Amino acid sequence: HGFVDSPGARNYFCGAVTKPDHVMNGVARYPECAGAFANDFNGGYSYMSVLTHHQGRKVLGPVARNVCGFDSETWNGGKTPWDNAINWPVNNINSGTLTFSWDISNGPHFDDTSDFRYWITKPGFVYQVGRELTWADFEDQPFCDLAYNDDNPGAYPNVRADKPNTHFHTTCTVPARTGRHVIYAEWGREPPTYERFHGCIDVQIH
Numbered sequence: 001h002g003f004v005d006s007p008g009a010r011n012y013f014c015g016a017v018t019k020p021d022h023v024m025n026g027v028a029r030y031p032e033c034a035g036a037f038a039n040d041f042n043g044g045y046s047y048m049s050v051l052t053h054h055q056g057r058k059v060l061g062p063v064a065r066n067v068c069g070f071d072s073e074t075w076n077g078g079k080t081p082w083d084n085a086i087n088w089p090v091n092n093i094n095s096g097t098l099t100f101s102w103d104i105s106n107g108p109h110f111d112d113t114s115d116f117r118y119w120i121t122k123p124g125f126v127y128q129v130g131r132e133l134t135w136a137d138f139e140d141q142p143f144c145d146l147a148y149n150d151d152n153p154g155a156y157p158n159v160r161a162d163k164p165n166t167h168f169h170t171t172c173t174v175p176a177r178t179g180r181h182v183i184y185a186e187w188g189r190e191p192p193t194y195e196r197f198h199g200c201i202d203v204q205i206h
């Protein structure tokens with residue numbers, strides 16, 4: 001159970017940081033989360049639970065009707081808060097080497113993590129409020145596809161478990177891009193669960 005907190009995913013900003021009730025009370029760090037929680041108030045508190053039990057975009061192909069939530073089981077295979085196309089907060093980043101960090105404090109699965117995978121929107125991508133993502137918006141293959149076996153931490157330098165702070169830190173190379181983009185991210189586990197967690201990261205590349 002967890003989510004990407006650097007660069008912060010939609011369910012970081014609206015979930016881990018800004019809670020539904022914060023928005024209501026007008027005391028939110030991110031008032032723009034109003035739009036994520038407008039039609040699903042209490043689902044906002046399950047930001048760590050955007051999960052499936054299959055091997056994700058790479059293996060099933062572009063099958064899920066909703067990109068960011070990947071038709072999560074927690075929403076009965078329908079839309080999550082983070083599939084909404086609203087005025088999301090954005091991460092300003094550069095192309096090249098970047099750490100993608102998962103906060104797994106809510107449900108660490110160090111021992112049977114299998115993979116981390118990231119896809120990015122195609123160069124021709126135009127972000128627009130109210131227009132929800134399609135798989136056609138993203139490259140077909142992940143730009144970053146990291147195996148892991150906690151038995152042999154040595155063999156995976158691009159994956160770094162931090163057990164005390166219950167984080168995974170992963171290293172990717174974000175490809176040449178500029179402007180507003182989305183990175184779609186997956187954290188997957190081995191059998192027996194095959195559980196997988198899904199996130200979108202809003203980015204402004206330089």
Ligand SMILES: [Cu+2]
Pocket residue numbers: 001002106107108109
């Ligand atoms: Cu979990």
